[PDB]
Write a protein that holds these residues in place. Structure first.
Motif, PDB file in Angstrom:
ATOM      1  N   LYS A 132      44.138   1.127  22.334  1.00 12.56           N
ATOM      2  CA  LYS A 132      45.130   0.315  21.644  1.00 12.56           C
ATOM      3  C   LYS A 132      45.418  -0.992  22.379  1.00 12.56           C
ATOM      4  O   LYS A 132      46.527  -1.525  22.275  1.00 12.56           O
ATOM      5  CB  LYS A 132      46.424   1.108  21.457  1.00 12.56           C
ATOM      6  CG  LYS A 132      46.301   2.312  20.534  1.00 12.56           C
ATOM      7  CD  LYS A 132      46.772   1.993  19.126  1.00 12.56           C
ATOM      8  CE  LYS A 132      46.234   3.004  18.126  1.00 12.56           C
ATOM      9  NZ  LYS A 132      44.804   2.762  17.792  1.00 12.56           N
ATOM     10  N   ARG A 189      45.202 -19.022  -9.668  1.00 14.27           N
ATOM     11  CA  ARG A 189      46.082 -19.087  -8.514  1.00 14.27           C
ATOM     12  C   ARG A 189      45.661 -20.278  -7.673  1.00 14.27           C
ATOM     13  O   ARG A 189      44.562 -20.815  -7.834  1.00 14.27           O
ATOM     14  CB  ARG A 189      46.027 -17.798  -7.688  1.00 14.27           C
ATOM     15  CG  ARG A 189      47.013 -16.733  -8.124  1.00 14.27           C
ATOM     16  CD  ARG A 189      46.701 -15.396  -7.477  1.00 14.27           C
ATOM     17  NE  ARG A 189      45.266 -15.163  -7.359  1.00 14.27           N
ATOM     18  CZ  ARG A 189      44.472 -14.827  -8.366  1.00 14.27           C
ATOM     19  NH1 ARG A 189      44.932 -14.707  -9.600  1.00 14.27           N
ATOM     20  NH2 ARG A 189      43.182 -14.612  -8.129  1.00 14.27           N
ATOM     21  N   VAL A 190      46.548 -20.688  -6.776  1.00 14.22           N
ATOM     22  CA  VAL A 190      46.241 -21.744  -5.821  1.00 14.22           C
ATOM     23  C   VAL A 190      45.600 -21.097  -4.603  1.00 14.22           C
ATOM     24  O   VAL A 190      46.173 -20.182  -4.003  1.00 14.22           O
ATOM     25  CB  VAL A 190      47.499 -22.533  -5.432  1.00 14.22           C
ATOM     26  CG1 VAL A 190      47.160 -23.579  -4.387  1.00 14.22           C
ATOM     27  CG2 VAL A 190      48.113 -23.181  -6.655  1.00 14.22           C
ATOM     28  N   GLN A 191      44.407 -21.557  -4.245  1.00 18.78           N
ATOM     29  CA  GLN A 191      43.725 -21.016  -3.083  1.00 18.78           C
ATOM     30  C   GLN A 191      44.438 -21.440  -1.804  1.00 18.78           C
ATOM     31  O   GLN A 191      45.158 -22.441  -1.763  1.00 18.78           O
ATOM     32  CB  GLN A 191      42.271 -21.482  -3.053  1.00 18.78           C
ATOM     33  CG  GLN A 191      41.609 -21.513  -4.413  1.00 18.78           C
ATOM     34  CD  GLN A 191      40.141 -21.162  -4.346  1.00 18.78           C
ATOM     35  OE1 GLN A 191      39.279 -21.982  -4.656  1.00 18.78           O
ATOM     36  NE2 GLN A 191      39.846 -19.937  -3.933  1.00 18.78           N
ATOM     37  N   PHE A 192      44.230 -20.660  -0.745  1.00 17.45           N
ATOM     38  CA  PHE A 192      44.830 -20.995   0.538  1.00 17.45           C
ATOM     39  C   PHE A 192      44.088 -22.112   1.255  1.00 17.45           C
ATOM     40  O   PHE A 192      44.587 -22.616   2.266  1.00 17.45           O
ATOM     41  CB  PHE A 192      44.897 -19.755   1.434  1.00 17.45           C
ATOM     42  CG  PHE A 192      43.630 -19.478   2.189  1.00 17.45           C
ATOM     43  CD1 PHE A 192      42.544 -18.897   1.561  1.00 17.45           C
ATOM     44  CD2 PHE A 192      43.534 -19.785   3.534  1.00 17.45           C
ATOM     45  CE1 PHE A 192      41.383 -18.639   2.261  1.00 17.45           C
ATOM     46  CE2 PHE A 192      42.377 -19.530   4.236  1.00 17.45           C
ATOM     47  CZ  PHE A 192      41.300 -18.956   3.599  1.00 17.45           C
ATOM     48  N   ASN A 206      39.867 -13.825  -3.019  1.00 18.02           N
ATOM     49  CA  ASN A 206      39.451 -15.212  -2.844  1.00 18.02           C
ATOM     50  C   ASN A 206      40.640 -16.132  -2.598  1.00 18.02           C
ATOM     51  O   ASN A 206      40.567 -17.036  -1.758  1.00 18.02           O
ATOM     52  CB  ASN A 206      38.656 -15.672  -4.065  1.00 18.02           C
ATOM     53  CG  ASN A 206      38.041 -17.040  -3.876  1.00 18.02           C
ATOM     54  OD1 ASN A 206      38.619 -18.052  -4.266  1.00 18.02           O
ATOM     55  ND2 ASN A 206      36.861 -17.078  -3.270  1.00 18.02           N
ATOM     56  N   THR A 207      41.740 -15.925  -3.324  1.00 21.63           N
ATOM     57  CA  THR A 207      42.884 -16.825  -3.210  1.00 21.63           C
ATOM     58  C   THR A 207      43.526 -16.735  -1.830  1.00 21.63           C
ATOM     59  O   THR A 207      43.828 -17.760  -1.207  1.00 21.63           O
ATOM     60  CB  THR A 207      43.904 -16.511  -4.306  1.00 21.63           C
ATOM     61  OG1 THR A 207      43.507 -17.148  -5.526  1.00 21.63           O
ATOM     62  CG2 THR A 207      45.289 -17.004  -3.916  1.00 21.63           C
ATOM     63  N   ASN A 208      43.727 -15.521  -1.328  1.00 23.20           N
ATOM     64  CA  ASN A 208      44.373 -15.328  -0.036  1.00 23.20           C
ATOM     65  C   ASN A 208      43.881 -14.036   0.602  1.00 23.20           C
ATOM     66  O   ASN A 208      44.261 -12.943   0.165  1.00 23.20           O
ATOM     67  CB  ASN A 208      45.894 -15.304  -0.190  1.00 23.20           C
ATOM     68  CG  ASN A 208      46.614 -15.664   1.092  1.00 23.20           C
ATOM     69  OD1 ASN A 208      46.026 -15.650   2.173  1.00 23.20           O
ATOM     70  ND2 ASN A 208      47.895 -15.988   0.979  1.00 23.20           N
ATOM     71  N   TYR A 260      35.388  -0.772  21.548  1.00 27.83           N
ATOM     72  CA  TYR A 260      36.135   0.211  22.323  1.00 27.83           C
ATOM     73  C   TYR A 260      35.384   1.528  22.475  1.00 27.83           C
ATOM     74  O   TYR A 260      35.981   2.511  22.932  1.00 27.83           O
ATOM     75  CB  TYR A 260      37.508   0.473  21.695  1.00 27.83           C
ATOM     76  CG  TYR A 260      38.574  -0.496  22.143  1.00 27.83           C
ATOM     77  CD1 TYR A 260      38.750  -0.788  23.487  1.00 27.83           C
ATOM     78  CD2 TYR A 260      39.401  -1.122  21.222  1.00 27.83           C
ATOM     79  CE1 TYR A 260      39.721  -1.674  23.902  1.00 27.83           C
ATOM     80  CE2 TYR A 260      40.375  -2.010  21.628  1.00 27.83           C
ATOM     81  CZ  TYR A 260      40.530  -2.282  22.969  1.00 27.83           C
ATOM     82  OH  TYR A 260      41.500  -3.167  23.378  1.00 27.83           O
TER      83      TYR A 260
END
Lengths: 337, 185, 201
Positions: free
Chosen positions: A96, A255-258, C62-64, C148
């Motif tokens: 971890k 949608r608006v892409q990032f 695709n968008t986020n 790991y």
RNA sequence: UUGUUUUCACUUUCUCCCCGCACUAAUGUGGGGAAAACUGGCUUUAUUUCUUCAAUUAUUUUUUUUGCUGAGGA
RNA sequence: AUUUCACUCAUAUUAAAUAAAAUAACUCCAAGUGGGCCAUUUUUGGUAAGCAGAACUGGCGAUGAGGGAUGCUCCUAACGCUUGGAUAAGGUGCCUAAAUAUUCGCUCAUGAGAUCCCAUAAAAGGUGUUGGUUCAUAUGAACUAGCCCUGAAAAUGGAUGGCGCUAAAGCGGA
RNA sequence: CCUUCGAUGUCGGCUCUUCCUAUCAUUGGGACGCAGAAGUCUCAAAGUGUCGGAUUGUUCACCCGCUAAUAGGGAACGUGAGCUGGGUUUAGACCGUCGUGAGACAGGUUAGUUUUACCCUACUGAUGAAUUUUAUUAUAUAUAUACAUAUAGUA
RNA sequence: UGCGAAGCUAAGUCUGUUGGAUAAUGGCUGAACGCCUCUUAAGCCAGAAACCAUGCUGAUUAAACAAUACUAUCUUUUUUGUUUGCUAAUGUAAAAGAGAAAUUAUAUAUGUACCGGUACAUAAAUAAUCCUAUCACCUUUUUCGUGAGCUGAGCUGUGAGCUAGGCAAUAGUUCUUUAACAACAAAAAAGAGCACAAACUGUAGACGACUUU
């Protein structure tokens, strides 16, 4: 349909989100690795913004068109008010991540370092680190035996002293610096000597080595697309203004892409500059470290006329190629390569 | 298609073996033998006063019965290889630039130069315990040898593919580092 | 099924069969802790499973990509997601069943000496032809970016030595218990001796 | 332009012999021969509980343990 | 040809069989309808079309229920409110109730495959598997056909329904 | 002609992002009728890049250049509450042909109002509580414990 | 008209890595058929701007977490209970022995002692197993172990046992066998500081927020 004139996008997605950094100091994601063969010594440093200046030189690269002829370059000189080493931290690898086994403080601590643990120091009782520095050495010996048996990464809490600098700030910046080198058996003895004294930079920093610079860039508040990503300005005939991205995405996906450049905060980002080779080692008190035997004038690290928005510099210096990020009075962090 | 397959491998006089759970451990003259053949379903019968191995495969279908043959001839063949070393006939070739050899560090980490004139570094290794060294009779010939059959043969295998050039018709430029024949010490 | 909790050593277990059995147990309400998930084996070549995971990796919104399918690289998380895809996690009862499961790589602290159970319905030695090709979840996860595997192996070998020590203690404890039993048998009255002898105790 | 009838070739073995003479998967094998037949089948005699009396179908008769239901009120 | 008198052709199972055949027959008054569409089989025009136009029957409309993940038309099956039983179609690794059931084969896919409609795939290559057939003295060919492979490329990221499955949870049986 | 005529803003260009590979260049290979160059065919490969201008409203096109290459396409022929309005496609007007005429012309020309976001979501940035049926890769001097642990505030 | 600080700015200056398995691409052995034969047989290697790592950016993207420093009357044992908006007070996704430590190989493995080999045991329906439960009470005879206190050791207590004795259950046929865990309230006994705001700053900023004094 396709674009008729394909061109590279604006900005880099690798620096997302372009949001305000949480802190002021430069954090380190990764320290240089360690090898069993290499000997146990230091692994990083820190300081402030002394100067990103020029120096005149002469290239020795074979076949260069300048070569023997004198040239002018761009390097930097670092501000090193000696950091006080106050703490020791042990890390052990687990599936971890690397987990803190324990930290140990020096039996005596400074007031500037302790001031950082407060938000209203002038009104507090200054009770931090009061009864935690009166522990027997049997506990220390047992826990360092545990560190040797179990821990595998060793770091040192070091804090700067802004009293030396002309900064208004009185809190001390605290960070941890890795210690890299040999096995645990040698490492235990090699980490038993410097546990309280302040840090001289020339201890490990040597000429002809590569380092990296970590800092937080300047701040500009909210800025438009033309500044944040350098998008093309719309023609003057545009109705609802010209300083914006025309199309922020196709019909589908709905949608608006990032990846679309938008207005927002620019600056106050975390930045690391790589491949910055250190070149020379000097001091603060001496009078001929920066100058050469072929210059035969008098000068030290001292500047002229004061530093704009920085005061005067009365601390150590070295040499290292490049220029730095951030603003004046901004803490800078120095890593090895 | 039938239910048993086996190869009555003949154990020569100069070898002594001990089988244990498809892990046969053998002693010859140059050294000892062991092998990891756990991929394949194999049962083994052994005797040592009257000798001969019997490597068998139960429910022998020709789907995988081609593997017992491979392992069996291979087994007799490592017997022969460790008793007497195997020697393939490797010859370096050079149409214009005679091959430059840098045999550094006793048959380990050899370097190759003077091949088409690149004048750079080219080094190819081999499995330890196998020699590929110059035969004094002819300079361009190297007497490959070693402990076992696979030991010698992978070394005779990896070397040819180490120095290939580019944009030159090999139907006309016959450059290479060849291997031709097989013999014994 | 009826125990307070079942600890399963996932070593040498086929991923799909193990996930199906574990999911059925969670739905029936049995708490399950899975250990040593990095020795889970998947049928098919390692390259085949690597191609499958690469196809899964290239797949995101695709968008986020933040809301895209969180791929996860640890073998324990891979087994957990495979089990989640086996039960109705969209409902309240399915969510409870999913949360009734714990997955670990290697053997953490509170699983040193509780009996690790094995379900033969998912064993490679019984559910896979010997001459056919299989993979290893730890190796595949390391290939797809876990970094790991070696640490888990070193922890596992240290645990092997540690457990071997007290197994060597336990065997001598048991073989002295049996020999005190041998002498204590003849100190019991004969009619009570006969019932133990004829019932094999 | 059908029937009928006729010939040899078939099986058991921990049998045995010889040759390769151990070459067997084995307390044997590859080949060539002798044995009776403890295999086997055939007919009987008192008995089917020492031992099988199967399976399917047709025709009958029960039986272990239990779920649900109680309309009506002559 | 019509009419009237005689006789008489099973009429007590019924001038062949079967028939919740009188739920018949007839008359009056009147609503809505008069854009249809789909499926199997047949068929015309069209390169073809979830295209246009026809025949039979059944459905959708006008109709839900179980299943085909999903679906106006596919399969089972049509519907008062309930309690038990047993099933149809279809399934029995988890999602999901019920077989990691039994038994016999085939297949390894570096884009395997996986329920009619149904959600594409062809010509051309196949000494793997098994079984054949024909021929020339345990010896060589030719084909043949099951699975698998190449042929087989598309745009948001991606779908045997998902997970996943290879001593199948795949394919063909029982 | 299956959905929209109680309206889904119908060309092009600019701007901006993303995706496909049937790869133009770059990467590493195989073949050539390949001496080497130069080039051609082809494989794995979408990581990176695919331009400045004259004419035309144009897409398309065709030239002048640079380049390493100036590859082909999708995203409601991507993108008008993003722009522009050059064209098409109201009403004015002109010419040619057709019509007796009013007028017609995928014939030509010229001039001709491009509306609204403060809502949801998406995207970009900026504050921010709450989080026990919740989490444990530990905690113990070659030795026990999940039948345990874990308060909370600030930093 | 000029510079025009500082900031902003570019048209100016600096910076912009190595590891893995890998696609295409050649060999070891080698069958099938006497033998040859890259694998329409088996196992192994050579190796690309592609992939994943490394590094970099976020991480209220994990409603995540760790260590440290200081502080807030606080922590253990017993009894009774939790049958003006409030000021006593209870909730379970699962108690009914919720019992169980080698590791590993699957065409047989684990121990023992020697030098992966040797020889010998172990194990092969393996959880189809083993371990754990009822002898109540009190009195007597006492035996062997652990804790308080005490000086390897005596006593007391605790656990288990031995000899002998005589002492109880009853509610009418069952309506869950009120039996677990955790929490909380009351009453007893024992021990046990900061942050916000304010002014300032300006390395920050639409406002919050952030850096400071």
């Amino acid at each position: 349909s396709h674009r008729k004139f394909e061109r590279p996008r604006h900005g880099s997605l690798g620096f997302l989100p372009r949001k305000r950094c949480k802190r002021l100091r430069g954090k380190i994601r990764s320290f240089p690795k360690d090898d069993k063969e290499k000997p146990p010594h230091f692994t990083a440093f820190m300081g402030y913004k002394a100067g990103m200046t020029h120096i005149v030189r002469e290239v020795d690269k074979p076949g260069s068109k300048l070569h023997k002829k004198e040239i002018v370059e761009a390097c930097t000189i670092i501000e090193c008010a000696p950091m006080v080493v106050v703490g020791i931290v042990g890390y052990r690898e687990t599936p971890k991540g690397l987990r803190i086994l324990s930290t140990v403080w020096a039996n005596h601590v400074s007031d500037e370092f302790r001031r950082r643990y407060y938000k209203n120091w002038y009104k507090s009782e200054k009770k931090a680190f009061t009864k935690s520095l009166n522990v027997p050495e049997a506990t220390k010996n047992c826990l360092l035996k545990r560190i040797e048996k179990y821990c595998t990464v060793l770091r040192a809490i070091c804090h700067t002293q802004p009293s030396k600098t002309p900064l208004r700030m009185k809190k001390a910046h605290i960070m941890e610096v890795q210690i890299n080198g040999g096995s645990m058996k040698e490492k235990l003895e090699f980490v038993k000597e410097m546990l309280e004294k302040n840090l001289p930079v020339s201890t490990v920093f040597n000429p002809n080595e590569m380092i990296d610079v970590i800092s937080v860039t300047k701040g500009h508040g909210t800025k438009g697309v033309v500044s944040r990503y350098g998008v093309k300005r719309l023609p003057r005939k545009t109705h609802r203004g010209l300083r914006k991205v025309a199309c922020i995405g196709a019909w589908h996906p709905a949608r608006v892409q990032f990846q679309i450049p938008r207005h927002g905060q620019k600056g106050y980002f975390h930045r690391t500059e790589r491949n910055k080779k250190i070149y020379r080692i000097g001091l603060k008190t001496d009078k001929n470290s920066a100058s050469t035997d072929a210059d035969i004038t008098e000068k030290k690290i001292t500047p002229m006329g004061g530093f704009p928005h920085y005061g005067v510099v009365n601390e150590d210096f070295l040499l290292l190629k490049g220029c730095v990020a951030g603003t004046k009075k901004r803490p800078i962090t120095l890593r090895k390569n | 298609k039938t239910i048993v397959s086996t190869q009555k491998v003949l154990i020569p006089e100069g070898v002594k073996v001990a089988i244990n759970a498809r892990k046969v451990t053998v002693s010859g003259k140059y050294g000892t033998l062991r092998r990891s053949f756990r991929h394949l379903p194999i049962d083994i019968r052994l005797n040592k006063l009257k000798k001969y191995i019997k490597v068998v495969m139960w429910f022998g279908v020709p789907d995988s019965l081609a593997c017992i043959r491979t392992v069996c001839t291979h087994l007799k063949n490592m017997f022969t290889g460790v008793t007497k070393k195997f020697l393939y006939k490797m010859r370096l070739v050079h149409a214009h630039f005679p091959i430059n050899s840098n045999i550094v560090d006793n048959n380990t980490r050899i370097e190759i130069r003077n091949y088409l004139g690149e004048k750079s570094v080219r080094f190819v290794k081999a499995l330890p315990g196998v020699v590929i060294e110059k035969s004094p009779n002819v300079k361009d010939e190297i007497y490959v040898s070693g402990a076992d059959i696979e030991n010698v043969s992978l070394t005779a295998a990896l070397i040819h593919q180490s120095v290939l050039c580019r944009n030159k018709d090999i139907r006309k430029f016959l450059d290479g580092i060849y291997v031709s024949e097989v013999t014994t010490v | 099924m009826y125990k307070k909790e079942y600890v399963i050593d996932c070593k040498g277990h086929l991923l799909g069969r193990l996930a199906s059995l574990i999911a059925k147990e969670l739905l029936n309400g049995q708490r399950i802790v899975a250990v040593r998930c990095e020795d889970i084996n998947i049928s098919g070549s390692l390259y085949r499973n690597k191609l499958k995971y690469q196809e899964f990796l290239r797949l995101r919104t695709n968008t986020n990509p933040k809301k895209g399918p969180l791929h996860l690289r640890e073998p324990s998380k891979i087994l957990w997601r495979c089990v989640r895809g086996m039960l109705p996690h969209k409902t309240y009862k399915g969510q409870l069943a999913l949360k009734k499961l714990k997955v670990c790589v290697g053997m953490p602290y509170p699983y040193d000496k509780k009996k690790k159970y094995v379900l033969p319905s998912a064993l490679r030695a019984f559910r896979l032809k010997k001459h056919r090709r299989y993979c290893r979840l730890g190796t595949l996860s390391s290939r797809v970016g876990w970094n790991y595997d070696t640490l888990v192996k070193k922890n596992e070998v240290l645990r092997k030595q540690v457990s071997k020590a007290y197994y060597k203690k336990k065997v001598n404890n048991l073989n002295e218990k049996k020999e005190i039993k041998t002498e204590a048998l003849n100190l019991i009255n004969p009619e009570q001796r006969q019932v133990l002898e004829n019932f094999g105790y």
